[PDB]
Amino acid sequence: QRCGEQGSNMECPNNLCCSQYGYCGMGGDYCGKGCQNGACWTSKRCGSQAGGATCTNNQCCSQYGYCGFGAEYCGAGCQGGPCRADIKCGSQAGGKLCPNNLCCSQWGFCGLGSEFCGGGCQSGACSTDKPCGKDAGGRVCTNNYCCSKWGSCGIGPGYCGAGCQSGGCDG
Amino acid sequence: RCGEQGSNMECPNNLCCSQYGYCGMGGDYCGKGCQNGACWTSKRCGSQAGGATCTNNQCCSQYGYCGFGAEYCGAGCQGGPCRADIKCGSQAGGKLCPNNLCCSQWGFCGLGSEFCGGGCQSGACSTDKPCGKDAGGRVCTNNYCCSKWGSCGIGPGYCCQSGGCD
């Protein structure tokens, strides 16, 4: 019902600003001082300039560790985000995982869509619901996903709670 | 809550929002009934779908599908963080940036001091120009509400001289 800290780090639709009180809106009382995420007037930090932090709302982290959109952000020197340059991952990039749970295709590139998540998907939010756990021969999940008691990879109470076999299981 | 159950909000890091309005990964969240996020069955968009836009700041491909990667943000990219500069504003027939993106004083869509500062035309400009009676009866862009104190925005304190009022 709320957003941000007050709501499990939820993000407002269409880049609306989540203010300090965990509500979605637009304007100084939402994008001014104390703005959490969304189109905050004060660009949040990220990348190397911010201990490896990433950009919320799927924004682009410029080479100067600033979040946003446009050539100045997703262009040359884009360190994380929907950068304009192809982003290699997995086998062809030293195990490297895709940002924000993007599927790493068989050809070794991050993204979302059947091409990236369908047959051959190596990691991320793969559409290929590859089994895990005991009945899968002890197979574990990528991205440190929790392996439900039923033997399916994912995230959530039914995955990380009771019966959880591997991955970042509920402590 | 998220999706229909949470004022159409989205989960961070492209986490799918299930039909029951909860965020997560796996078949329970991305499979049958997915509302947004990295849904296994990608959402339709663009000219192929009544010019509807993509959630999670996903790019709409030349085939009307939401997602990321070259196939989506490359050539034919209809919406989202397309790789090809997106023209807008006075330099593009008064066109609006999708998803409240800032249209710079050069008529390109983006987010940052360059795109939302200075002569920002539309989108979520960080300039906040006054509106209404005390601003020559000025009107907010994007149908933004003009507060009873001359400030453009959305919400209760903004929705009210002009705009998407209540």
Ligand SMILES: *NC(=O)O[C@H]1O[C@H](CO)[C@@H](O)[C@H](O)[C@H]1NC(C)=O
């Ligand atoms: N068709 C195809 O395989 O494209 C692949 O190769 C280029 C690299 O030159 C990438 O830009 C494409 O995005 C990549 N496609 C996928 C799905 O990874």
Ligand SMILES: *NC(=O)O[C@H]1O[C@H](CO)[C@@H](O)[C@H](O)[C@H]1NC(C)=O
């Ligand atoms: N090859 C191809 O046409 O891919 C496209 O069509 C399928 C539907 O058959 C969709 O799954 C893909 O998302 C779509 N690819 C793109 C980039 O839209």
